[PDB]
Design a protein around this ligand. Structure first.
Ligand SMILES: C=CC(=O)Nc1ccc(C)c(C(=O)N[C@H](C)c2cccc3ccccc23)c1
Ligand SMILES: [Cl-]
Ligand SMILES: [Cl-]
Ligand SMILES: [Cl-]
Ligand SMILES: [Cl-]
Ligand SMILES: [Zn+2]
Ligand SMILES: [Zn+2]
Ligand SMILES: [Zn+2]
Ligand SMILES: [Zn+2]
Length: 305
């Protein structure tokens, strides 16, 4: 048979699996204690890294040394394999199961923004997800986010974790802070901090300025001087918000109470589409509880001296 950690580098091997190889998985399902059948023969098994060659191969494919990672990934995959991934409005969604609404919203969002994942495991799975086969990609999202199946998930926290595994180095955000007393200070943010803001949904309002505390004691004004990124994510606690066709890429709708409510996805095409897992409605106007709005960007410089 063949052992692997990445399903690229295959090593030939020939008493339980757990005694010979340590924790040994097949197609999601733990076969550590279980024995070697005759149709459990010739195929490819995943193993926990137990020698240097496999640790290096594991880090090179996943970008983590965390020894739980593989087990958390296989426990997720055992469920995500059984979910349905229908095409909805030319996007791979997920049918509702095991509290996955937040994952579906993230997955739909990731198909509409420009992102390169550093870990080969994630990039490969992203491409396969975009082409309709998203089980692997969803298991990896759960593992990288330290979330298990059924656990209550936040889209902003999931996007934040995923962004930290993505090539956002070229992304730059210059902010000016204007206080009556302390005066003007400019800050350069890079990477994840350049593409994410919590406090308002409106990219327009971020450019025009928002009111934040100053250390001195007063209320100051933060405004956007310069943005170099393919997109920005604007987030705020759920609040009734109007979404206008053509002024945003997509948005997370969040209904109900902290943690135990539900997400739906709004996307701006030729009209506004609402994706609720397998279900698709459309309308020209939208007002509802929004918590995330994604916008297109390349290069922005303010006309405020
Ligand atoms: C840190 C621990 C944690 O478990 N976080 C987490 C996990 C899972 C979920 C669904 C949420 C969450 O309900 N997020 C929504 C969008 C939300 C965000 C911020 C402020 C809010 C105010 C009122 C209602 C919703 C609010 C947060
Ligand atoms: Cl890394
Ligand atoms: Cl299941
Ligand atoms: Cl759900
Ligand atoms: Cl990474
Ligand atoms: Zn990395
Ligand atoms: Zn399940
Ligand atoms: Zn849900
Ligand atoms: Zn001040």
């Amino acid at each position: 048979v063949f052992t692997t950690v990445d399903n690229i580098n295959l090593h030939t091997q020939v008493m339980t699996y757990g005694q010979q190889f340590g924790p040994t998985y097949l197609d999601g399902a733990d076969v550590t204690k279980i024995k070697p059948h005759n149709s459990h023969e010739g195929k490819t098994f995943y193993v926990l890294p137990n020698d240097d060659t496999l640790r290096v191969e594991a880090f090179e494919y996943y970008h983590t040394t965390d020894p739980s990672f593989l087990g958390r990934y296989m426990s997720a995959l055992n469920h995500t394999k059984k979910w349905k991934y229908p095409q909805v409005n030319g996007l791979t969604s997920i049918k509702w199961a095991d509290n996955n609404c937040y994952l579906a919203t993230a997955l739909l969002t990731l198909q509409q923004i420009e992102l390169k994942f550093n870990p080969p495991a994630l990039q490969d799975a992203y491409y396969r997800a975009r082409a309709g086969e998203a089980a692997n990609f969803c298991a990896l999202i759960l593992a990288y986010c330290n979330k298990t199946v059924g656990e209550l998930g936040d889209v902003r926290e999931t996007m934040s974790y995923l962004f930290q595994h993505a090539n956002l180095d070229s992304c730059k955000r210059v902010l000016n802070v204007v206080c009556k007393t302390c005066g003007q200070q400019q800050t350069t943010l890079k990477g994840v901090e350049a593409v994410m803001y919590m406090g308002t949904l409106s990219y327009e309002q971020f450019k025009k300025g928002v009111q934040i505390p100053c250390t001195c004691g007063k209320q100051a004004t933060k405004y956007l001087v310069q943005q170099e990124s393919p997109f920005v994510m604007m987030s705020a606690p759920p609040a009734q918000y109007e979404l206008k066709h053509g002024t945003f890429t997509c948005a997370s709708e969040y209904t109900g109470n902290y943690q135990c409510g539900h997400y739906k996805h709004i996307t701006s095409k030729e009209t506004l589409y609402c994706i609720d897992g397998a279900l698709l409605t459309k309308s020209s106007e939208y007002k509802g509880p929004i918590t995330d709005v994604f916008y297109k960007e390349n290069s922005y410089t303010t006309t405020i001296k």
